[PDB]
């Protein structure tokens, strides 16, 4: 039972680390998408700012 | 012995890592909301200036 118990306790941990890694990767995809969005917005706000002060 | 003691920093840490990810998800969810809100407010302005 000893060596067996130790094996299962390893397996659960390693499985869990993989879950955590996948979650982090998915979260990194989300982050990169938010960066895309922020860039998009920044440009459109910058154009609105210049337009209002090009008219001025 | 050393096994039970070793599994200790590891299990503690695994749960720490999990708690961190969950909290960062809440942060991601909040940045998404913020981005959606701004998008809608930029539009409102652009469409206002395109109609004016």
């Amino acid at each position: 039972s000893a060596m067996a118990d130790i094996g299962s306790e390893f397996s659960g941990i390693v499985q869990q680390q993989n879950n955590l890694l996948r979650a982090i990767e998915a979260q990194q995809h989300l982050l990169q998408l938010t960066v895309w969005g922020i860039k998009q917005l920044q440009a459109r706000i910058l154009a609105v700012e210049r337009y209002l002060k090009s008219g001025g | 012995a050393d096994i039970g003691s070793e599994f200790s920093g590891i299990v503690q840490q695994q749960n720490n890592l999990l708690r961190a990810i969950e909290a960062q998800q809440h942060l991601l969810q909040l940045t998404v909301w913020g981005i959606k809100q701004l998008q809608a407010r930029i539009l409102a302005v652009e469409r206002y200036l395109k109609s004016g």
Partner: peptide
């Protein structure tokens, strides 16, 4: 793979990744 990216695609990916992350976190709990 990312481009061509748009606000529609952006939204669709946000939703799928989020659901994915929820799935992983929920599997983590039990």
């Amino acid at each position: 793979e990312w481009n061509e990216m748009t606000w529609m695609e952006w939204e669709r990916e946000i939703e799928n990744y989020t659901k994915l992350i929820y799935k992983i976190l929920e599997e983590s709990q039990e």
